[PDB]
Amino acid sequence: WSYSQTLSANIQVNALQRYQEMIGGGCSGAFGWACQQFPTTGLTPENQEEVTKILFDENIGGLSIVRNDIGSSPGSTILPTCPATPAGPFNYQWDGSDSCQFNLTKTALKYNPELYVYANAWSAPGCMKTVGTENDGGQICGVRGTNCTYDWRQAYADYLVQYVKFYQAEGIDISLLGAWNEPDFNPVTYESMESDGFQAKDFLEILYPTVKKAFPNLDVSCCDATGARQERNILYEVQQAGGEHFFDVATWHNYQSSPERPFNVVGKPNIMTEWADGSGPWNTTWDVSGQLAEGLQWALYMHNAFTNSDTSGYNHWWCAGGGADNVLISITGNSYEVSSRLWAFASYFRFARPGSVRIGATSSVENVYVSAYENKNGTVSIPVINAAHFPYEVTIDLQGLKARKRVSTFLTDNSHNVTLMDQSELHGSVLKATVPPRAVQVFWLE
Amino acid sequence: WSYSQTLSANIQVNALQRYQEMIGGGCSGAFGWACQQFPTTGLTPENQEEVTKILFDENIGGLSIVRNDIGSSPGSTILPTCPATPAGPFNYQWDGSDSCQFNLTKTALKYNPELYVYANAWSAPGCMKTVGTENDGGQICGVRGTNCTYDWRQAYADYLVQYVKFYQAEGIDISLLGAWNEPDFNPVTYESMESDGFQAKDFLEILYPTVKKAFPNLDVSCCDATGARQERNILYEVQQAGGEHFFDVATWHNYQSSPERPFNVVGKPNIMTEWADGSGPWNTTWDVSGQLAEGLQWALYMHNAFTNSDTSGYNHWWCAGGGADNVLISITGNSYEVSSRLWAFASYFRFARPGSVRIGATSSVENVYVSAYENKNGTVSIPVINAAHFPYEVTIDLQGLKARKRVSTFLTDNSHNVTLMDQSELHGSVLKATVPPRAVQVFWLE
Ligand SMILES: *[C@@H]1O[C@H](CO)[C@@H](O[C@@H]2O[C@H](CO)[C@@H](O[C@@H]3O[C@H](CO[C@H]4O[C@H](CO[C@H]5O[C@H](CO)[C@@H](O)[C@H](O)[C@@H]5O[C@H]5O[C@H](CO)[C@@H](O)[C@H](O)[C@@H]5O)[C@@H](O)[C@H](O[C@H]5O[C@H](CO)[C@@H](O)[C@H](O)[C@@H]5O[C@H]5O[C@H](CO)[C@@H](O)[C@H](O)[C@@H]5O)[C@@H]4O)[C@@H](O)[C@H](O[C@H]4O[C@H](CO)[C@@H](O)[C@H](O)[C@@H]4O[C@H]4O[C@H](CO)[C@@H](O)[C@H](O)[C@@H]4O[C@H]4O[C@H](CO)[C@@H](O)[C@H](O)[C@@H]4O)[C@@H]3O)[C@H](O)[C@H]2NC(C)=O)[C@H](O)[C@H]1NC(C)=O
Ligand SMILES: *[C@@H]1O[C@H](CO)[C@@H](O[C@@H]2O[C@H](CO)[C@@H](O[C@@H]3O[C@H](CO[C@H]4O[C@H](CO[C@H]5O[C@H](CO)[C@@H](O)[C@H](O)[C@@H]5O[C@H]5O[C@H](CO)[C@@H](O)[C@H](O)[C@@H]5O)[C@@H](O)[C@H](O[C@H]5O[C@H](CO)[C@@H](O)[C@H](O)[C@@H]5O)[C@@H]4O)[C@@H](O)[C@H](O[C@H]4O[C@H](CO)[C@@H](O)[C@H](O)[C@@H]4O[C@H]4O[C@H](CO)[C@@H](O)[C@H](O)[C@@H]4O)[C@@H]3O)[C@H](O)[C@H]2NC(C)=O)[C@H](O)[C@H]1NC(C)=O
Ligand SMILES: *[C@@H]1O[C@H](CO)[C@@H](O[C@@H]2O[C@H](CO)[C@@H](O[C@@H]3O[C@H](CO[C@H]4O[C@H](CO)[C@@H](O)[C@H](O[C@H]5O[C@H](CO)[C@@H](O)[C@H](O)[C@@H]5O)[C@@H]4O)[C@@H](O)[C@H](O[C@H]4O[C@H](CO)[C@@H](O)[C@H](O)[C@@H]4O)[C@@H]3O)[C@H](O)[C@H]2NC(C)=O)[C@H](O)[C@H]1NC(C)=O
Ligand SMILES: *[C@@H]1O[C@H](CO)[C@@H](O[C@@H]2O[C@H](CO)[C@@H](O[C@@H]3O[C@H](CO[C@H]4O[C@H](CO)[C@@H](O)[C@H](O)[C@@H]4O)[C@@H](O)[C@H](O[C@H]4O[C@H](CO)[C@@H](O)[C@H](O)[C@@H]4O)[C@@H]3O)[C@H](O)[C@H]2NC(C)=O)[C@H](O)[C@H]1NC(C)=O
Ligand SMILES: *[C@@H]1O[C@H](CO)[C@@H](O[C@@H]2O[C@H](CO)[C@@H](O)[C@H](O)[C@H]2NC(C)=O)[C@H](O)[C@H]1NC(C)=O
Ligand SMILES: *[C@@H]1O[C@H](CO)[C@@H](O[C@@H]2O[C@H](CO)[C@@H](O)[C@H](O)[C@H]2NC(C)=O)[C@H](O)[C@H]1NC(C)=O
Ligand SMILES: *[C@@H]1O[C@H](CO)[C@@H](O)[C@H](O)[C@H]1NC(C)=O
Ligand SMILES: *[C@@H]1O[C@H](CO)[C@@H](O)[C@H](O)[C@H]1NC(C)=O
Ligand SMILES: *[C@@H]1O[C@H](CO)[C@@H](O)[C@H](O)[C@H]1NC(C)=O
């Protein structure tokens, strides 16, 4: 809703003030959701291509991250049968599908050559865990606080690297490798594995050099905790245990604690690697209810992470399929619907491409939000969020961007999906525009 | 889970550093949940008393806040029929039940004489709203951005004060009065009413002096937003509109944004007035899964709010009844179970009573959390949370508490519910103790 009233906001953007390097937005096809995106029954191949294109085409959804589950379940793992001991031999199996995640990754890469693939294990194979199963939590055999018949840490590291090798041989580079999912949480009934930061360091001291020996440019994550506070606690313990230099990227989920402050690592970026409305019905609205599933709220959640926790990437849970509101694109039979959450993603990532750097942006009005990003080639994005219920006349002072010639204005609200509204020449360093209520307006400077 | 390892933590507590004044913990019986706690069949009257005592007895749950819905629905409102215009006559009705909330409040007061009652409207009567119904959001007629036939603001203020008068005539003092619930959110199907901060100020400028004339010590809240960020935006706008001194307490819910920083108001306390696991099954465990419903997680959520957003009070959603995990005590027939979330509440509020002041407390270990509270009468509570998975030997240095002579130690973990562990004489200003893994240990100084 909105009403007639106009106020003003002053914004200053300063390319001399520089923060994090951005990675992008993304989603997962884990647990067979990639097969709902690529079913070859119901959704036609034309429509499966279109759905993936909507997500990963720079000009539409703008996404760049595909997060794949290194599976550990019957029929989803590269190690369906384990050797008796870590001496092996190991019989690795690749079916060219990987629960259709290979299809998802290959197709996303077709539409986005800058794809950032995150291979993330939810559990080790059960044979290398205290509980003897990929379900029900438990620990990698060989970290402190375990008493298994053998130390399986090297074997688990080698297994993760082999998964990466399968994708490399198909011509797909992995960008990030993770060995846990939500290690602070035991869901019991599906792939899971628990850890504190001391036990995590006990594994990372083996994983990290093993990875760099095979793939010197492959980054290692830690540790996909359920929330920001749980991640900070694991990060503290990893560093306390001596493992500061055994991971490269802090990864965390937004389910069980959300941050308003940075993470407790120096010199490492962070990615929010999973979040969704896990309980509500399928939803597409931008700003009708004010509920957390809506697109405008996701624009605001992302602004908070990028400006207050210096976050470099942001992932929905699933890309496309069933699962009610857990996807960005809902698929039923040969039909699909796009949630306006994707246009919140696009408002950031259609314009701030991988390698862009967040730069200084301030607003004189608390709920007229602004951030700004400078691409490697010097183009600049300024996504402004008018979270108020009436229009704001904004004035944007540009510092450090004198080499800019043109400005294009894009709008997302209840009747606009990143719509091009205006294009003008830049004849000074000041932008003036009226931002509609409850909207994201992106100023694209070239 | 835990393992064998011991590390140490240094803690410093300083009564010379002083923060917020505490109000307490509590819950609601709105929407008929008080009638599930006091039912006409099933739970016996003796068990109804016992459930209320478990919540509000200082020695058990330690809660002090009862949050009541000033109802607006057929059968639950003090204004069953509206006059045609704000001139009235208003035919107010008091049935002495208030959807059993009177019984909840009167029984809670019997177990806690310091009960802090928060009377909170979810919506104005439909006749005073733009939408003509208590459901489906909409605005108080007469705030900016409305074009109703009449300005109903004074009438709504008088109606809220009359509700308070009915309670005060029955011998129950109301401590806080709120005119909206989640004004950033429209659930459509139940009592709701929307507002931005400008519109809220337009009503608060009438409600506030109306309230203080009738009840000079009755505090006014604003505005029970669905999350911390939504509350900050409304508070910004109320103050931008000129309304800084038309409310007394900032109220907010933890559903759609959680804080790690203070709220944007000077000289006013804040209360987190509603949160719960809205979707999961009924749950009582302390630390088995690591899921957000668990008692240990709630202890940590409260620590975060009290130490990082200076929060003075904390409410579950419902007190007791059905509704899966939305209650602190589940009732089925003549049986009940208590969630260990209640022992997280007690770890703070059994010992930090109304009027206590949060004092300085630091820990040398990130996930050994500490806070500290000084009661008006000089006793001090120090709730330490060992969020690690092994025991910590803590050393607590006490500054500014020379005149305390005794310490009692209370423990909550998977096998203890605020159990008295030890009582010792206080020699010197140094406490030493081993805090078990995944536990809240309270040091009670007298
Ligand atoms: C400051 O401040 C603070 C805070 O506030 C404080 O403190 C506090 O105080 C309060 C007041 O006083 C209190 O309360 C109270 O209480 C009571 C009871 O008591 C009892 O109990 C308790 C508890 O117990 C439990 O716990 C424990 C621990 O753990 C254990 O051990 C036990 O066994 C138990 O257990 C159980 O339970 C639990 C839960 O609870 C569980 O968990 C478990 O498991 C189990 O089950 C206790 O504590 C006590 O004891 C104590 O004390 C005694 C004396 O009495 C002694 O002898 C002992 O020894 C002890 O002490 C020790 O310890 C402790 C701990 O425990 C420590 O702390 C110390 O220090 C020492 O060391 C007992 O046993 C009650 O009764 C009360 O009530 C009342 O009041 C109310 C209000 O307030 C009301 O409502 C009610 O109703 C009543 O009323 C009545 O009374 C009054 C007076 O009293 C009046 O006024 C009225 O009117 C009425 O009257 C009527 O009635 C009567 C009778 O009663 C008659 O007589 C007449 O005539 C008429 O008819 C109260 O509530 C609390 O407790 C406290 N806290 C703490 C923590 O401590 C302080 O004090 C201050 N200070 C200053 C200086 O000021
Ligand atoms: C600095 O970095 C910047 C960031 O990267 C960079 O900007 C971006 O550059 C890239 C690379 O060039 C651009 O991406 C290309 O886009 C081509 C299509 O371009 C045309 O369509 C665009 C989108 O059009 C929609 O949106 C507009 C804005 O709302 C509307 O006006 C349109 O009507 C249209 O709307 C429809 O779709 C919307 C969703 O998209 C929807 O909301 C709406 O409702 C409606 O449905 C237009 O922006 C663009 O228009 C501009 O350019 C034309 C000139 O062509 C002008 O006439 C226009 O007036 C306007 O100025 C175009 O119309 C793609 O074809 C291209 O694909 C190729 O490349 C990718 C990989 O990048 C491959 O995967 C793909 O297969 C293609 O490969 C083929 O070609 C390449 C060479 O092109 C070759 O190498 C390869 O081997 C193969 O042969 C690519 O995706 C991106 O659009 C730019 N973004 C922005 C925001 O501008 C910037 O240029 C850099 N600057 C410098 C100096 O380096
Ligand atoms: C400290 O504080 C804690 C927290 O309050 C107290 O611990 C809790 O106590 C309550 C009761 O006071 C417990 O609830 C009861 O649990 C028992 C045990 O159930 C378990 O074991 C059974 C085998 O003996 C098993 O059958 C159960 O499994 C069934 O039920 C679960 C429910 O989740 C379901 O998921 C399964 O699929 C099964 O269907 C379970 O594993 C249980 O038997 C009790 O049932 C009785 O009462 C209920 C009414 O509540 C009634 O409906 C039943 O028919 C039956 O009459 C009841 O559920 C609770 O589990 C405890 N929680 C924890 C974390 O321990 C603790 O007691 C306090 N300490 C002290 C000293 O007081
Ligand atoms: C900008 O981006 C937004 C967000 O992606 C787009 O808006 C969404 O568009 C989709 C379709 O692409 C909409 O989904 C469709 O909504 C229709 C309306 O549903 C309402 O009204 C009917 C009428 O009775 C009710 O039955 C229903 O419950 C709703 O109240 C539906 O009719 C559509 O149903 C279709 O699919 C189902 C599949 O089971 C079939 O049963 C039907 O027969 C039919 O084939 C569908 O659900 C969605 O509502 C839009 N959301 C919003 C917030 O607008 C914009 O289109 C896009 N802009 C542009 C220009 O493209
Ligand atoms: C999420 O978005 C959906 C649409 O994708 C909204 O669906 C509406 O549902 C109500 C019934 O609950 C219908 O009367 C409307 O016609 C639906 N709208 C449309 C456009 O189809 C749903 O309300 C949204 N939920 C939230 C919480 O915002
Ligand atoms: C919340 O607490 C309940 C107990 O109140 C836990 O219940 C267990 O549920 C599983 C199935 O999900 C049963 O097999 C167990 O027997 C139950 N335990 C008991 C003691 O009844 C439940 O697991 C907890 N949920 C979370 C997420 O922690
Ligand atoms: C997935 O890709 C493989 C080869 O990469 C192909 O054989 C198979 O048909 C694809 N599956 C779907 C459902 O598109
Ligand atoms: C570990 O397990 C083996 C085999 O059960 C047992 O012999 C050994 O004592 C255990 N180690 C410890 C330290 O308990
Ligand atoms: C509510 O309180 C009155 C007076 O104490 C009592 O008579 C009535 O039975 C109570 N109602 C219920 C449902 O317990």
Q: Is residue A71 part of a domain?
A: yes
Residue B143: DSSP 8-state: B
Q: What share of chain B is helix, strand, coil (3-state, %, to 5)?
A: 25, 30, 45
Closest Cα in chain B to A289: B186
Q: Is residue B413 part of a domain?
A: no
Per-window interface: A 206-235 vs B, CB < 8 A: 226-227, 229-230, 232-233
Looking at the complex, does the CB of residue A324 fall below 8 Å from at least one CB of chain B? no
Distance CA A199, CA A217 (A): 25
Residue B370: DSSP 8-state: E
CA of A377, closest atom in ligand 2: 1
Distance CA B93, CA B80 (A): 7
Q: Is residue A197 part of a domain?
A: yes
Angle at A114 between CA A220 and CA A54, to 5 degrees: 115
| A24-28/B372-374 β-pairing | unpaired
Distance CA A371, CA A393 (A): 17
Helical segments of B242-384, H only: 295-308, 341-349
| A439-445/A406-413 β-pairing | antiparallel
Give B69-127 as a 3 state SS string: EECCCCCCCCCCCCCCCCCCCCCCCCCCCCCCHHHHHHHHHHHCCCCEEEEEECCCCHH
Elucidation technique: X-ray
Q: Is residue B393 part of a domain?
A: no
Distance CA A338, CA A111 (A): 18
Distance CA B379, CA B373 (A): 8
Q: What share of chain A is helix, strand, coil (3-state, %, to 5)?
A: 25, 30, 45
Residue B7: count other Cβ atoms within 10 Å of its Cβ.
14
CA distance B432 to chain A (A): 22
Distance CA B418, CA B344 (A): 9
Distance CA A241, CA B354 (A): 41
Q: Is residue A134 part of a domain?
A: yes
Burial pattern B132-148, b for ≥16 Cβ within 10 A else e, equals ebbbbbbbbbbbebbeb
Distance CA B347, CA B350 (A): 6
* Listed resolution, Å: 1.8
CA distance A273 to chain B (A): 18
| A270-274/A249-253 β-pairing | parallel
Phi, psi (deg, nearest 5) at residue B308: -110, -25
The pocket around ligand 4, CB under 6 angstroms, is made up of A 284-285, 332, 335, 337-338, 340, 417
Q: Is residue B430 part of a domain?
A: no
* CATH code of residue B75: 3.20.20.80
Looking at the complex, does the CB of residue A136 fall below 8 Å from at least one CB of chain B? no
C-alpha distance from residue B34 to each of B31, B66, B97, B134, B332 (Å) = 8, 11, 10, 21, 14
**B264/A260 Cβ within 8 A:** no
Closest CB from A137, A304, A367 relative to B236: A367
Phi, psi (deg, nearest 5) at residue B69: -85, 120
Distance CA A127, CA B338 (A): 38
Helical segments of A245-314, H only: 295-308
Nearest Cα neighbor of B145 from B132, B129, B157 is: B129
Tokens describing residue A15: 């390319």
**B366/A232 Cβ within 8 A:** yes
The pocket around ligand 3, CB under 6 angstroms, is made up of B 284-285, 332, 335, 337-338, 340, 417
Q: Is residue B398 part of a domain?
A: no
Looking at the complex, does the CB of residue A148 fall below 8 Å from at least one CB of chain B? no
Distance CA B150, CA B147 (A): 8
Nearest Cα neighbor of A177 from A224, A229, A108 is: A224
Are the C-beta atoms of A409 and A421 separated by less than 8 Å?
Answer: yes
Cβ pairs A/B, distance under 8 A: 109
Range of the domain at B163: 17-358
Instruction: Report the Cα B154 to chain-centroid distance in Å.
Output: 28
Residue A261: count other Cβ atoms within 10 Å of its Cβ.
14
| Number of domains, chain A | 1
Residue B384 in contact with ligand 9 by CB distance below 6 A: no
Distance CA A156, CA A24 (A): 29
Distance CA A120, CA A207 (A): 13
Q: Give A238: exposed, middle or buried? Use CB within 10 Å, 0-12, 13-18, 19+.
A: buried
Distance CA A347, CA B2 (A): 44
Please provide the size of chain B in residues.
446
Radius of gyration of chain B (CA): 22
Nearest Cα neighbor of B130 from B115, B140, B120 is: B140
Q: Is residue A3 part of a domain?
A: no
